[PDB]
Amino acid sequence: VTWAPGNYPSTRRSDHVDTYQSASKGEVPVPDPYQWLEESTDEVDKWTTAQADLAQSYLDQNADIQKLAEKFRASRNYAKFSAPTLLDDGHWYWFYNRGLQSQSVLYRSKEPALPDFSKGDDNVGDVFFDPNVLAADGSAGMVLCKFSPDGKFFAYAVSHLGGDYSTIYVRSTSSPLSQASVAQGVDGRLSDEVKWFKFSTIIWTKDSKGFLYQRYPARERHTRSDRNAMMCYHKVGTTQEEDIIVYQDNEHPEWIYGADTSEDGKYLYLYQFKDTSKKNLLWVAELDEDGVKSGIHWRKVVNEYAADYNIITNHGSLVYIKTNLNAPQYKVITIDLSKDEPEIRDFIPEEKDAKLAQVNCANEEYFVAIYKRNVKDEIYLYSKAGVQLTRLAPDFVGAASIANRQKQTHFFLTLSGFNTPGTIARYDFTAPETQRFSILRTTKVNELDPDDFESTQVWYESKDGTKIPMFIVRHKSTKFDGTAAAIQYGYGGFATSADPFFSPIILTFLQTYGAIFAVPSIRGGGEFGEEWHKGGRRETKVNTFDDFIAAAQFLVKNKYAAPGKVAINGAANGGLLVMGSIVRAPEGTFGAAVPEGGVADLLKFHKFTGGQAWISEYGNPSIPEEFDYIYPLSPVHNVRTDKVMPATLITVNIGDGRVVPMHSFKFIATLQHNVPQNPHPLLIKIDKSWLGHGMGKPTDKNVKDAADKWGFIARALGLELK
Amino acid sequence: DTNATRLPIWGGCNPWTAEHVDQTLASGNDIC
């Protein structure tokens, strides 16, 4: 009912001890007094209720949270839309959100012509597929979808609250799903029901008769682990009992699979992955009149784990592939399958100082390429002969992506950044030269003016001398004079790049309080290719934390931010980053900390759900040499009694299947035990709605959770509303 | 892509924070 120092809920300490092997020390007994917080019991429910009530009572003292909620709701209340796609029926299809809807709605053009979108989405299109009505009570979400190549069918993956897998349904594209259609008649879908779908997409064959998908074994209620994956094929207009097993491997039950089909109908491709590193196998089958069947003959083109290989397209037996083989910034190769021993050659060579992030074939023979140089995307068009023809959108600063179908005479680019809400560009091959590139739509926001904000990139030095760039965003009236507060974000792993992105919530906060936003490109990410990742993983993981701490220290030292006013935030691996940073950094480096759904027990992560796959990133705690570098880094095992911690709000969702909430529960119990008299509050907020696989929360709930996180940060850094 | 769907990460199209909530812009990029 009321927070003060030393007023935390009583938390039983058990006598559980685990024994590990260390290469340098031999046997190490490790106490785990909060092992019981791994479980789901009455005692755990009482403990979570008491923590969550303590956190809510503290937030209730802060009258600025309700004001932030109103500011944030308004900042998100503007229409949003995707790039459109032309199907073989001659009509264009795009997603549209009115502003605050929980799931966006798939629209279809009224006429078979590219709409003039300035007239408004409802005047040029009608509803084709509204995912909000999948269940009457809103408890069902569409996680992904794919139209067939001929445009006649629409496949869609659905999750429900409480569920660990998705289910694929199929419907005719002339049978829409709307409020009106559900009130007036039957659903209008086929009886097809493809269950146990996970960690996959939907890959149609070019004859439009069916699709490939990954599934797991059927499981009765009476544990939580996904093994023995199967790549399968489902024929449209049949039931799942008739689905074909395309590939599985009982000798390697942890491996998983992906697939692709070539545009000309000639090839089926199989990808295999052994863990979360960027290494895959690649096998190739030739299709014929018999289609997809059991006993497919596989040519094992890549059959050892060594590099990342992803198919772009083919012309006859020449196959174009994006790879990092001997090329950590990536490149394009060709593999010629007409030879018995395939001949491998560079098509677009590796750029030493820019990462090849994406390549698509457009208008049958051209290639569109996105390079990421200094964490900023650049777009180029190439000929069939591999000649760089031109740069597109040369003044754009941010992140970019391509949307097209190989056979068509246009493509789109979707562009966004720290002050670019969402621009959709079109390139039309049939128009005159000099009139091919144009802007289809621009996203207009609410209350905010993106021109009021300056985004720059600066460089700092890490502990070992390494030079690291960092994005900084401010409202233009804020000075770098040692007085502003800073919010610093990070992820730090798995070769994921911390790219620019647009958030109306972040910019609203910066303008409200005169704070700055900082995004350092720390090692472990993929900003500078595979060597950047290698610089912060397994035995070099410590560098990720050193880089993040040095960024915060640089902000204060060079007067971007005031001493003691740097707050840090991150999610999942980003939560690990925040929790490890508060433990390792000197006292007073940070003024607030918010880890969301984070990893924290680095000795037991591999014992739960899909954690085994992350041995690629963190190492294996049961190998003696690797224990020696993991143990000194595990946040749960390195909390001390003698360092003041900053104000901390841990957040978790109770149904999280990817990162079990165990991790956060153990960290917060350990904090409260070790520094019970800490002058700043150490709290955990626990959401008890059990989210289904791949589902988000409702919009209204996301607005409220954002007001709580940002209001907590504001108060901890001593910021007031004017 | 396939392998990224099981990272310890917040949400496809690289949503590495909670403020990535709005995915409408890229959601049409690969639907056929």
Side-chain angles (χ1 to χ4, degrees):
Chain A
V1 80
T2 175
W3 187 87
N7 195 39
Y8 298 116
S10 79
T11 301
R12 186 173 62 88
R13 289 174 62 81
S14 80
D15 67 358
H16 192 93
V17 177
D18 302 297
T19 311
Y20 291 92
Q21 295 301 132
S22 161
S24 65
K25 293 283 154 175
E27 269 187 51
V28 185
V30 178
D32 197 33
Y34 306 121
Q35 180 281 320
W36 66 272
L37 291 169
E38 291 163 27
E39 312 292 0
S40 168
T41 72
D42 182 68
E43 191 195 9
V44 172
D45 290 353
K46 270 153 189 189
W47 183 90
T48 56
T49 296
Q51 292 288 354
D53 293 355
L54 181 67
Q56 192 56 68
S57 212
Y58 187 75
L59 296 168
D60 290 348
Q61 295 170 13
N62 181 341
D64 298 346
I65 291 176
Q66 168 64 355
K67 311 294 207 199
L68 286 192
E70 303 157 22
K71 288 175 190 282
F72 291 169
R73 191 191 319 289
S75 89
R76 294 193 66 199
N77 194 11
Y78 63 88
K80 296 164 207 81
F81 35 77
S82 74
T85 304
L86 175 59
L87 311 181
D88 290 12
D89 66 358
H91 282 257
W92 297 79
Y93 295 74
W94 68 97
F95 285 102
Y96 170 68
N97 197 306
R98 285 157 61 94
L100 301 168
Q101 300 180 277
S102 286
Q103 303 183 74
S104 299
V105 175
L106 187 48
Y107 271 60
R108 171 186 181 273
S109 66
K110 292 181 188 175
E111 305 300 336
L114 183 60
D116 178 4
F117 291 98
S118 67
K119 298 177 168 149
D121 295 70
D122 284 305
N123 292 119
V124 305
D126 289 314
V127 171
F128 163 64
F129 187 84
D130 183 350
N132 297 283
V133 315
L134 283 164
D137 70 353
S139 68
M142 190 200 77
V143 302
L144 62 83
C145 66
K146 243 181 230 167
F147 285 105
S148 67
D150 70 3
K152 299 179 173 136
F153 290 114
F154 178 72
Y156 52 108
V158 181
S159 299
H160 295 74
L161 296 184
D164 288 327
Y165 302 90
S166 295
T167 307
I168 314 312
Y169 299 97
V170 186
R171 77 194 305 108
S172 165
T173 305
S174 62
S175 177
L177 182 74
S178 66
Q179 297 277 355
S181 78
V182 173
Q184 289 169 35
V186 304
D187 194 292
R189 66 167 176 82
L190 304 177
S191 64
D192 297 34
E193 187 174 44
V194 181
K195 305 199 90 188
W196 314 103
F197 170 84
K198 202 172 189 176
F199 305 142
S200 184
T201 187
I202 292 164
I203 300 291
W204 289 88
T205 44
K206 299 324 195 218
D207 61 6
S208 297
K209 296 181 185 164
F211 56 84
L212 296 120
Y213 70 98
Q214 180 170 249
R215 61 158 293 181
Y216 285 86
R219 59 163 37 137
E220 292 284 1
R221 174 76 174 74
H222 306 285
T223 67
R224 200 181 180 185
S225 163
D226 304 314
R227 293 174 18 116
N228 296 85
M230 299 161 273
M231 182 60 58
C232 295
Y233 180 78
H234 173 69
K235 182 183 172 205
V236 173
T238 194
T239 70
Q240 192 168 26
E241 287 92 318
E242 302 182 59
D243 289 10
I244 298 284
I245 297 179
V246 171
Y247 195 74
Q248 69 181 302
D249 187 353
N250 287 259
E251 333 182 326
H252 298 108
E254 81 278 20
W255 295 11
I256 64 167
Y257 311 101
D260 260 327
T261 51
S262 75
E263 180 67 31
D264 66 8
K266 194 175 181 217
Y267 293 125
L268 175 63
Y269 304 110
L270 176 68
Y271 303 117
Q272 307 185 227
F273 308 93
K274 66 166 191 189
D275 61 12
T276 46
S277 75
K278 304 286 222 170
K279 294 190 271 257
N280 64 282
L281 310 182
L282 169 55
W283 299 355
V284 186
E286 293 181 338
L287 296 165
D288 63 17
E289 289 140 72
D290 291 305
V292 177
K293 41 157 203 186
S294 64
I296 279 192
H297 188 186
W298 296 109
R299 185 174 180 178
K300 306 178 175 149
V301 175
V302 175
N303 206 40
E304 306 285 7
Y305 287 100
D308 186 340
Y309 295 94
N310 193 65
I311 306 295
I312 304 172
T313 196
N314 68 293
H315 296 299
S317 26
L318 205 55
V319 185
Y320 294 73
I321 308 183
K322 184 168 67 71
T323 185
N324 69 359
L325 174 68
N326 305 137
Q329 300 272 23
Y330 291 77
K331 64 178 172 182
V332 183
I333 58 162
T334 56
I335 294 176
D336 188 343
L337 299 175
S338 66
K339 320 309 180 170
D340 69 62
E341 190 65 63
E343 165 174 81
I344 310 183
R345 289 175 164 171
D346 291 348
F347 175 68
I348 297 174
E350 187 191 18
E351 284 293 305
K352 184 187 162 75
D353 295 297
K355 182 188 176 172
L356 179 59
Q358 184 182 12
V359 185
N360 292 28
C361 181
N363 192 33
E364 289 295 348
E365 314 162 289
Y366 294 73
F367 293 99
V368 187
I370 291 165
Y371 282 93
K372 183 173 284 153
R373 190 195 316 279
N374 295 301
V375 208
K376 285 166 280 184
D377 288 354
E378 310 179 348
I379 307 106
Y380 301 87
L381 184 62
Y382 287 78
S383 74
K384 56 169 171 154
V387 178
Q388 196 182 273
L389 301 168
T390 190
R391 181 156 177 198
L392 304 167
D395 300 312
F396 167 70
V397 181
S401 310
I402 312 160
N404 81 307
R405 304 175 68 198
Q406 187 177 302
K407 76 190 186 168
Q408 288 172 339
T409 62
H410 63 272
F411 61 90
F412 299 100
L413 311 169
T414 57
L415 309 174
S416 69
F418 294 119
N419 48 19
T420 303
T423 295
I424 303 173
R426 179 169 65 105
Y427 190 97
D428 177 11
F429 283 95
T430 72
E433 299 155 334
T434 77
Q435 309 177 25
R436 302 196 175 184
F437 184 87
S438 75
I439 303 303
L440 184 80
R441 313 187 69 166
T442 294
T443 302
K444 314 281 158 178
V445 299
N446 186 54
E447 293 183 10
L448 282 177
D449 185 341
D451 301 343
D452 295 336
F453 299 86
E454 179 209 274
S455 152
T456 55
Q457 184 171 61
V458 299
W459 293 81
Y460 70 100
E461 183 176 334
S462 202
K463 184 199 193 153
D464 72 6
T466 306
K467 305 298 190 168
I468 300 174
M470 170 163 63
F471 295 117
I472 297 173
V473 191
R474 58 167 176 178
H475 186 263
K476 290 174 174 179
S477 63
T478 295
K479 296 170 183 290
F480 298 142
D481 64 352
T483 61
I487 309 295
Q488 180 177 300
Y489 273 29
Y491 185 77
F494 298 93
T496 46
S497 291
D499 292 324
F501 65 99
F502 186 77
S503 170
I505 302 270
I506 290 164
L507 299 183
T508 290
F509 189 86
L510 304 185
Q511 180 173 359
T512 296
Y513 291 112
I516 67 174
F517 181 60
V519 182
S521 307
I522 67 192
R523 286 171 290 179
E527 294 86 345
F528 301 99
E530 150 67 26
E531 304 263 45
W532 207 244
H533 183 202
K534 189 186 144 153
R537 71 158 187 254
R538 296 169 62 84
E539 77 276 3
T540 65
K541 196 76 220 169
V542 65
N543 298 336
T544 300
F545 295 90
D546 288 334
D547 289 354
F548 200 63
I549 292 166
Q553 289 171 326
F554 174 87
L555 294 167
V556 174
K557 180 70 160 148
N558 287 42
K559 312 278 165 162
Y560 293 95
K565 303 208 175 184
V566 182
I568 51 171
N569 176 233
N573 191 70
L576 168 64
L577 180 63
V578 173
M579 287 181 279
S581 297
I582 68 177
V583 170
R584 299 179 66 78
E587 208 179 86
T589 296
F590 304 109
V594 185
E596 309 185 49
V599 175
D601 193 335
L602 277 186
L603 301 183
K604 290 181 165 181
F605 75 87
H606 69 308
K607 301 288 209 197
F608 294 88
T609 194
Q612 98 185 328
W614 316 331
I615 288 167
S616 76
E617 190 68 16
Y618 306 139
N620 195 326
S622 301
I623 293 173
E625 293 67 27
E626 302 176 14
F627 177 93
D628 285 356
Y629 67 66
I630 296 159
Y631 186 48
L633 219 47
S634 182
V636 163
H637 303 100
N638 286 277
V639 179
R640 292 170 63 75
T641 66
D642 67 355
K643 284 176 74 174
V644 173
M645 295 291 191
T648 299
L649 185 65
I650 308 188
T651 70
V652 290
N653 299 307
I654 205 76
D656 199 339
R658 216 62 29 81
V659 180
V660 290
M662 184 278 283
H663 290 282
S664 297
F665 296 167
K666 285 188 181 176
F667 191 70
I668 195 65
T670 305
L671 279 179
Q672 293 176 355
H673 172 81
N674 276 284
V675 287
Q677 300 305 312
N678 204 60
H680 317 305
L682 306 173
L683 306 172
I684 187 165
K685 191 176 104 111
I686 302 169
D687 181 355
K688 297 203 170 164
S689 175
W690 200 296
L691 296 164
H693 171 61
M695 303 182 70
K697 292 176 189 194
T699 294
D700 60 9
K701 189 76 201 277
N702 280 322
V703 168
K704 194 264 184 185
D705 286 347
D708 284 342
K709 168 171 94 175
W710 291 92
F712 179 86
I713 290 164
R715 170 148 293 169
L717 308 183
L719 307 174
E720 284 86 334
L721 284 171
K722 292 157 163 226
Chain B
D1 207 320
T2 288
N3 206 15
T5 62
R6 62 177 187 165
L7 301 180
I9 197 170
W10 186 83
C13 263
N14 189 22
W16 57 272
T17 251
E19 278 67 39
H20 284 75
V21 282
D22 229 291
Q23 295 290 111
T24 308
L25 180 69
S27 64
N29 287 359
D30 190 29
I31 63 176
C32 189

